[PDB]
Write a protein that binds this ligand. Structure first.
Ligand code: HEM
Length: 291
């Protein structure tokens, strides 16, 4: 498969900045969701799950075709709870019907990170909606009950290396786990809707204990009332991942720079951009615009 990026006809930077603005204003307004965490966390989870289905071997899956809109992918067990992020974005798509699904789902992830005080993420437009038979089969997204070898191998299918994987996993300081969605329950840390290097500090400084939760799954719980997945615990069990964890724990700006590079790579996997294509856009925040 080849997937060539095609800009939505006649649209420029200013059109996409208006879709970003609409997502950012609604994030501000619907502040009460999930006990006042807001929708920022589930929107960056949605952007990673529509991108995480990519397979480098045959170019299937990934963000291009916007196939999460189809039933097979929408009802994948691994996507449980993302229906909330979808319903958030739906009035926004009615307001700007010209944007493709893949572009809207991925831009929601970018808008969430920047509005939660994260780094600027360069974003490219041009994903094109593809038919229901291009929808990937369930089962390509990663299990949580596994170790650092599983993690390294999994992320190789998206050709992410060690530094990219540890930077990406920094997103597990956002939001929380929910028993009814995944069989895991608890907050990741103290600041769950502001983007920081907190995951790495908790990984190095908390007194973590292995326990079973009410769904019979194992998770690591700390004295502070925080939890972590087995796959997050991996990052301090593997010697290569651990030196990168330490690096991000001591330097939030290095974490922001690397997360920014790896998250854009993730959202662009499987997409060929022509060089007539516009450069990646850097959107201004509401605050930068005085809105
Ligand atoms: C081995 C990799 C990964 C596994 C196994 C994994 C698994 C999970 C699970 C089980 C949850 C809890 C879902 C729930 O109960 O609602 C979760 C939440 C979340 N994940 Fe991941 N994750 C992985 C990678 C990532 C990456 C790479 C990102 C983003 C760049 C990410 C972002 C998030 C966010 C923001 C949440 C919180 C969502 C919310 O608050 O509703 N995860 N993850």
């Amino acid at each position: 498969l080849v997937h060539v990026a095609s800009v939505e006809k006649g649209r420029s930077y200013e059109d996409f900045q208006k879709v970003y603005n609409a997502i950012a204003l609604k994030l501000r307004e619907d502040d009460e969701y999930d006990n006042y965490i807001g929708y920022g966390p589930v929107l960056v989870r949605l952007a990673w799950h529509i991108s995480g289905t990519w397979d480098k071997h045959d170019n299937t899956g990934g963000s291009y075709g916007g196939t999460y809109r189809f039933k097979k992918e929408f009802n994948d067990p691994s996507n449980a709870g993302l229906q909330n992020g979808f319903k958030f974005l739906e009035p926004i798509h009615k307001e700007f019907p010209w944007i493709s699904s893949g572009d809207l789902f991925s831009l929601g992830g970018v808008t969430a990170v920047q509005e939660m005080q994260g780094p600027k993420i360069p974003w490219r437009c041009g994903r094109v909606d593809t038919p229901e038979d291009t929808t990937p089969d369930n089962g390509r997204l990663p299990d949580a009950d596994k170790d650092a070898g599983y993690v390294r191998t999994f992320f190789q299918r998206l050709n992410m290396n060690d530094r990219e994987v540890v930077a990406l996993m920094g997103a597990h300081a956002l939001g929380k786990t929910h028993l009814k969605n995944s069989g895991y329950e608890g907050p990741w840390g103290a600041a769950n809707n502001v983007f920081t290097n907190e995951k790495y500090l908790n990984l190095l400084n908390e007194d973590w204990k292995l326990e079973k939760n009410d769904a019979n799954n194992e998770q690591w719980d700390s004295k502070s009332g925080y939890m972590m997945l087995p796959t997050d615990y991996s990052l301090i069990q593997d010697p290569k991942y651990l030196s990168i964890v330490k690096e991000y724990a001591n330097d939030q700006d290095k974490f922001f720079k690397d997360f920014s590079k790896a998250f854009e790579k993730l959202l662009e996997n499987g997409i060929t951009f022509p060089k007539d294509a516009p450069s990646p856009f850097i959107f201004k925040t509401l605050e930068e615009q005085g809105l």
